[PDB]
Amino acid sequence: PRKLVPLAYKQFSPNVPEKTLGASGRYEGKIARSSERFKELTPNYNPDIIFKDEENTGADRLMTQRCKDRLNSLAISVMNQWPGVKLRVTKGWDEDGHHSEESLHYEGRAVDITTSDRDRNKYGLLARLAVEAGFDWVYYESKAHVHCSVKSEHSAA
């Protein structure tokens, strides 16, 4: 077994920029509800994940299949790591311009996460679990959340 080392505040893994091929790849443009690319998004209703849904639109649940798959893996590992605690998404797909100009939040490929108990002391380890779950980039971006993203299916030729 490998020793699990939490990420430190502001650390990202892998240790390269988010939008490189070694990580989550390119920004492919905002997805709006009216977009053809809205069909890239699938609603995640995993009962073992809490969604903050601050906008009251369900947008946090709408994500690409790869994002869903990694999130669902992470949900198992979070409950393994801290029995009685669940994975929580505090921000997923952004319909409303609240991130930097080319954020993967705009295309349903990034989620900001916490544990369900909002114990900030758990977040460094949560970030390491997100790496182990196969997220393509994980960034301990603020004391309040870990930013996790995935590559798209559009760069493999």
List contacts with Zn ion (CB under 5 A): 110, 112, 147
Residues in the chain after which the backbone breaks (C–N beyond 2.5 Å): none
For the CB of residue 110, give the shortest distance to Zn ion in the complex, in Å.
5
- By C-beta, is 1 or 59 nearer to Zn ion? 59
- C-beta of residue 60 within 8 angstroms of C-beta of residue 22: no
- By C-beta, is 40 or 60 nearer to Zn ion? 60
- Name the 3-class secondary structure at 90: strand
For the CB of residue 101, give the shortest distance to Zn ion in the complex, in Å.
14
Nearest residue to Zn ion, scored by beta-carbon proximity: 147
Rounded to whole angstroms, how far apart are CA atoms 123 and 77? 14
For the CB of residue 68, give the shortest distance to Zn ion in the complex, in Å.
16
